[PDB]
Ligand binder design. Structure first.
Ligand SMILES: CSC[C@H]1O[C@@H](n2cnc3c(N)ncnc32)[C@H](O)[C@@H]1O
Ligand SMILES: CSC[C@H]1O[C@@H](n2cnc3c(N)ncnc32)[C@H](O)[C@@H]1O
Ligand SMILES: NCCCCN(CCCN)CCCN
Ligand SMILES: NCCCCN(CCCN)CCCN
Ligand SMILES: [Fe+3]
Lengths: 344, 344
């Protein structure tokens, strides 16, 4: 198995789908399989979109490189680097530990997390682990984006708004979500804990209400990752920032976003006056959601077994505005999911 | 003290110097001072360029907000967040540890580092801690950028090329440096250890020899941070990579690079075919260099005492190419340092 075979597998997928599939996607796919036979683990190790993985794995099996039977088994030696093992086990490779947050936020958060609303398919939900939420807020603490600040959270199954308000740092936290269950849980917690936290039912496909335009110092979001979803979550966030010196925090996966789309998103940030100051890949680990067998890619999977441990992860990005972002505050029409999206 | 005051201080410096100093850099300056009275620690905690810190501190002192004596003490209550304290102590906030590197690389590297060339002012040198070098290489291991790859290191006081070769993963490592001491040390270690590591004296202001153009899969550099220096080091890096799927690792400070410059660099990268896949801020810690009293900023400092612990830090950026970068291979003419540079 030589280099050209990786190139040819990628070109085949490219020809069949119109998607930006490269030879290095194939390399990554093979690399992961040097370390595991389990499909979900292969996804986690690969750093390739699940939309790409399926036809790549098919192409590799058509060439006799891969056996697809109860597992994914490499049948040949391959020109692909094996996954490294250098993640710091103390912080799960984050660099940040949420346990250190003020106000005993970590212990108080874990109590509330035990009663959180289940992730539902109606809103593409799937929350990160409590440690992930707390570390996300710890990053914001470290960069000075919580204390005395006005914080907006756009979608909050992760309960970032709650963790942030439990630290005792923000001036106030406002959460928007389409799901009344999330809104109500946050309002309940806000009342019981005496927090300056408010939550509102709002669908981000509609314009942002004028009270929230250029009114915040800091936003958090873990958005739907089609370009329209990026616009509706991250563009609203940028519109919500007062301007220069304000910060945003964004969750971004490989599972549903190609490196080509990573670049497009980075261009979108730079052209709207932002700059990236942190990008910690694999920072968030997601809890398995109940609706996995009803998601888009399920029927395509070569092995179909419910996952028993976490597999879906995302990066944390920190951005800062160098000037006010003057984005159109229009309705977003059309699908927030794109062709790369597979777990909705 | 109100937010308007922070804006005023910033505008004064901006007007006096022509540099892009904003209110948030003042806020960051003040926040650091809430946490420490030590100048070097204030620089570390600020995430602001030293070029900006000097005139911000002086402006704060003229306003009766800062006392400068044997330390730096705030004289009023200020609207600035304290930097948080959530970095993982096990990995020094990096999320990666060099210890599990293959080949006994960590232990072997530490032996060699005991005999390394000391940093000299003639080449603006200052090496990272041995664990920083090893962590950098471990990030590359984790991303599949070592095993069987062709590795170029552009500037190597950090000895990244030696650490990478010690893993036994690369197919070969080539190092370029203008300092013959660095080159000779690497040649010496390569022969002693029998590694596929070579080094060459090369001034990166001159064109890259053809043999190294589009020849490599991975590059590492920790560059001079004026725009010309970024062209001489990172641009040559980009030109050295074969193309799509090849990676680069770049060190980038706040101490000598403003966020306006960070954005211009990120633009430069996206426009020439790259995408950022990691940006771990504060990843590298630098050892203190012997010529600190002879560096540009020393006479300006409001308090002058030699540092006793590390203070100068940089981010580690991983980029990947989405396509070949066809940059010009011309002479770089002019100063690699710019007005934001202060440690040369
Ligand atoms: C995308 S999943 C993250 C969060 O976004 C919320 N969400 C999903 N779609 C939308 C939408 N169109 N507008 C607002 N919130 C949404 C979810 O209910 C969840 O809490
Ligand atoms: C900038 S310090 C990092 C490394 O770059 C090297 N260096 C500095 N200037 C040049 C240059 N013009 N060409 C090549 N290497 C350089 C130094 O010797 C050091 O090892
Ligand atoms: N469909 C379930 C898995 C996708 C979850 N997405 C929303 C997560 C919200 N916490 C991932 C978003 C990645 N940006
Ligand atoms: N001049 C004192 C220290 C300079 C550090 N610069 C060179 C470091 C090389 N290991 C910083 C480079 C930052 N990109
Ligand atoms: Fe750690």
């Amino acid at each position: 198995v030589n280099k050209e075979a990786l190139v040819q597998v990628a070109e085949e997928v490219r020809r069949a789908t119109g998607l930006p599939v490269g030879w290095r996607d194939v390399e990554r796919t093979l690399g992961a399989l040097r370390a595991t036979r389990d499909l979900w683990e292969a996804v986690r190790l690969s750093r390739v979109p699940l939309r790409f993985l399926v036809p790549i794995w098919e192409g590799l099996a058509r060439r006799g490189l891969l056996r697809v039977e109860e597992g994914l088994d490499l049948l040949a030696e391959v020109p692909a680097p094996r996954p490294g093992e250098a993640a710091c086990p103390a912080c799960e490779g984050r660099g940040l530990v949420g346990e250190r947050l003020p106000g005993r936020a970590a212990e108080r958060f874990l109590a509330w997390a035990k009663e959180r609303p289940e992730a539902i398919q109606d809103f593409d939900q799937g929350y990160v682990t409590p440690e992930s939420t707390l570390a996300r807020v710890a990053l914001a603490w470290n960069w000075g984006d919580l204390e005395g600040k006005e914080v907006l959270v756009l979608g909050d199954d992760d309960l970032t708004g709650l963790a942030a308000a439990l630290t005792g740092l923000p001036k106030r936290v406002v959460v928007l979500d389409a799901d009344p269950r999330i809104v109500r849980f946050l309002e309940r917690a806000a009342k019981a804990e005496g927090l300056p936290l408010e939550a509102h039912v709002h669908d981000l496909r509609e314009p942002l209400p004028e009270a929230w335009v250029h009114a915040f110092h800091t936003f958090f979001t873990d958005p739907v990752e089609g370009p329209l979803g990026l616009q509706a979550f991250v563009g609203r966030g940028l519109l919500a920032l007062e301007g220069e010196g304000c910060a945003g925090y964004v969750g971004l996966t490989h599972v549903e976003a190609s490196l080509a789309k990573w670049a497009d998103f980075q261009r979108f940030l730079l052209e709207n006056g932002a700059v990236i100051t942190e990008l910690r890949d694999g920072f968030h680990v997601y809890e398995n959601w109940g609706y996995i067998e009803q998601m888009r890619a399920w029927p395509w999977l070569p092995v179909k077994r419910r996952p028993e441990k976490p597999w879906y992860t995302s990066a944390l990005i920190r951005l800062e505005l160098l000037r006010r972002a003057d984005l159109e505050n229009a309705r977003v029409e059309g699908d927030l999911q794109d062709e790369e999206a597979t777990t909705y």
